[PDB]
């Protein structure tokens, strides 16, 4: 039983910035990776980036490196995402996932409910 709380939805103006926050609970936050996945209507899933807790310069996708910035706070036990310089087509659903490690071999076993962001 692991929970990955994530807000409902957000609506922002074009050219603005959005901060999406995913809060983890239950499991040990330090051990497991966290990834952010973007989903659209009529889509093929894309991976934006991932971040190990207590780390710097997390890995980013080549199509989201300039627009996405992932940070974590061990004290807050939350994972944050920042999206900037948005466009018309950057309206989708963004999920936060937890990577199982021992025998799962980095499978996103627990998922967030997702945030629907439209502009």
């Amino acid at each position: 039983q692991v929970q990955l709380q994530q807000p409902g939805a957000e609506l922002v103006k074009p050219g603005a910035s959005v901060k999406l926050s995913c809060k983890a609970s239950g499991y040990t936050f330090t051990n497991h990776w966290i990834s952010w996945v973007k989903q659209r209507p009529g889509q093929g899933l894309e991976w934006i980036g991932n971040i190990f807790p207590g780390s710097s310069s997390p890995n980013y996708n080549e199509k989201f490196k300039s627009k996405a910035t992932l940070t974590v706070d061990t004290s807050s036990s939350t994972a944050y995402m920042q999206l900037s310089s948005l466009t018309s087509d950057a309206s989708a659903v963004y999920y936060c996932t937890r990577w199982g490690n021992y025998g799962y071999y980095y499978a996103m076993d627990y998922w967030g409910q997702g945030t629907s962001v439209t502009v």
Binding site: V37, E46, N59, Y95, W111
Partner: protein
């Protein structure tokens, strides 16, 4: 870098017959994972690490694959099984499949 292609995009399977969902790769991948996303719900994990079965999943969901070609099998098709299925793998960074719709 591995390209995961799922064909066909939309596949029709009548209720009651066991059918296999297939995920193909451009290169060799060690372990592959399968996700089920129903209508208006976040994706779930069914089969983790090439046919190991995730907790809370009915035992009739099993996978089969090796090398490059991987597949997922359902023993019994039910009404509740309508969803969209993706295949995921880790090769120093994730790579999701196209996604196939399962309908009754």
């Amino acid at each position: 870098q591995i390209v995961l292609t799922q064909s066909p995009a939309i596949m029709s399977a009548s209720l009651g017959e066991e059918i296999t969902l297939t995920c193909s790769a451009s290169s060799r991948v060690n372990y592959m994972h399968w996700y089920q996303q129903k209508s208006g719900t976040s994706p779930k994990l069914l089969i983790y690490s090439t046919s190991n079965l995730a907790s809370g999943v009915p035992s009739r969901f099993s996978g089969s694959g090796s090398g490059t070609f991987y597949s997922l099998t359902i023993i019994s098709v039910e009404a509740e099984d309508a969803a969209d299925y993706y295949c995921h793998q880790w090769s120093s960074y994730p790579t999701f499949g196209g996604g196939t719709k399962l309908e009754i």
